[PDB]
């Protein structure tokens, strides 16, 4: 159900997430 | 299909 961030989200740059 | 961002 949820997408939570693994690292700090960044302006104008992609970052890593995981589904839970 | 849809997942919500926390």
């Amino acid at each position: 159900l949820d997408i939570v961030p693994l690292e700090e989200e960044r302006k104008g740059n992609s970052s890593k997430y995981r589904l839970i | 299909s849809k997942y919500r961002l926390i």
Partner: antibody, heavy 119, light 112 residues
Framework: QLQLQESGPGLVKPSETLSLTCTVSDGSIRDYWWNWIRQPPGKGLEWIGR???????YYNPSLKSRVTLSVDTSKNQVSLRLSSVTAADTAVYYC?????????????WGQGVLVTVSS | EVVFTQPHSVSGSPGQTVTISCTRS????????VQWYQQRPGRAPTIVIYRDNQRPSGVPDRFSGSIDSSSNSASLAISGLKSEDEADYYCQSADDSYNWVFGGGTRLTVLS
């Protein structure tokens, strides 16, 4: 916002290791990140480093040699260990954890623990 | 390497609008989000602005964040100034390695 149970010694002797912890109560220790900050009383904010759930660590170059950041998912806590301390490391230390009431997140800081370094 | 410099002191009378600037020394300020922290004496810093211009619930609409890529600066504007707004203010952003960098801090006085 987040109650974050920050804990540490009031007093640490030089060349000991100063160690602090913070814990979460929402079950989230396996995700997100922690930032660590400190403030010499009456001076500005200095960032120490970050540990996150990629399990990358980020450090202030001034301190990287002396800093260890760790997460114990069993105790639901982060720990900061700062080695080879001097009286110049006397500061209020803060842990910062992201608070997410929805899709957006902003950081919530601990109460602050003043560590005095003195032999 | 990169620093964010702030005025040491900003002052204004009740009802006036005050601005606190935060200028980045190298690289584009607009490349990383800018946060603004408020610190009342003896208490931990709390967010008043995050992601350049977003306000937590519980922070008045009197607080405004802005970005100016021409001056390479961020600004925190507080309108309708009140005695409760008296505090220290820190900008927080990041460098090309994603390490946090704080501004030097600004003491805001509500002139009485």
């Amino acid at each position: 916002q987040l109650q974050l149970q920050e804990s540490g010694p009031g007093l640490v002797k030089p060349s000991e290791t100063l160690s602090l912890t913070c814990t979460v109560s929402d079950g989230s220790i396996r995700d997100y990140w922690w930032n660590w900050i400190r403030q010499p009383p009456g001076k500005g904010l200095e960032w120490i480093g970050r540990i996150d759930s990629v399990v990358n660590t980020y450090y202030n170059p001034s301190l990287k040699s002396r800093v260890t950041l760790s997460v114990d998912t069993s105790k639901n806590q982060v720990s900061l260990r700062l080695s080879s301390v001097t009286a110049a490391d006397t500061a209020v230390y803060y842990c910062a954890r992201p608070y997410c009431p929805g899709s957006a997140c902003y950081d919530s800081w601990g109460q602050g623990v003043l560590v005095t370094v003195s032999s | 390497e990169v620093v964010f410099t702030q005025p040491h002191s900003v002052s204004g009378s009740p009802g006036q609008t005050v601005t606190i600037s935060c200028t980045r020394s190298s690289g584009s300020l607009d490349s990383e989000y800018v946060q603004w922290y408020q610190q009342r004496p003896g208490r931990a810093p709390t967010i008043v602005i995050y992601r350049d211009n977003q306000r937590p619930s519980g922070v008045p609409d009197r607080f405004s964040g802005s970005i100016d890529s021409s001056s390479n600066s961020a600004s925190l504007a507080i309108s309708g100034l009140k005695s409760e707004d008296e505090a220290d203010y820190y900008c927080q952003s990041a460098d090309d390695s994603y390490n946090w960098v704080f501004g030097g801090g600004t003491r805001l006085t509500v002139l009485s």
